[PDB]
């Protein structure tokens, strides 16, 4: 709606902002991340992973 | 098991599966 700039999600996090010059919807999504797991045999068998 | 069903589940097993079920909340946690 007019006079409505920011935005929030269910958990109260800034997910959208409005550009000052040219008003527009600007979603904010964090870049990808995650865990890393290493699969290895015994170090006395080989060294490949 | 019922061959016609693609998931290969007995007729009783289908009823159980379709009865518990469970920006959206799931994506909020992941971030």
Describe this structure in words.
- This is part of a larger assembly, with 2 copies of chain A.
- Chain A is an all-beta fold.
- Helices cover 0% and strands 20% of the residues of chain A.
- A 3-stranded antiparallel β-sheet of chain A has the order 1-2-3, with no helix packed on it.
- In chain A, a hairpin with a 5-residue loop joins strand 1 and strand 2 (14-18).
- The first copy, chain A, is rod-shaped.
- Chain A binds chain B through residues 9-11, 13, 15, 30, and chain B through 23-25, 28-29, 31.
- Chain B: This is Spike protein S2.
- Chain B: It comes from Severe acute respiratory syndrome coronavirus 2 (2019-nCoV).
- Chain B: The record marks 9-10 as: Cleavage.
Overview in brief:
It is classed as viral protein. The structure is cut from a larger assembly and holds 2 copies of chain A. Chain A has 49 residues and is mostly beta strands.
Provide the descriptors you would attach to this structure in a database record.
part of a larger assembly, 2 chains, 49 residues, mainly beta, 3-stranded antiparallel beta sheet, Spike protein S2 (chain B), viral protein
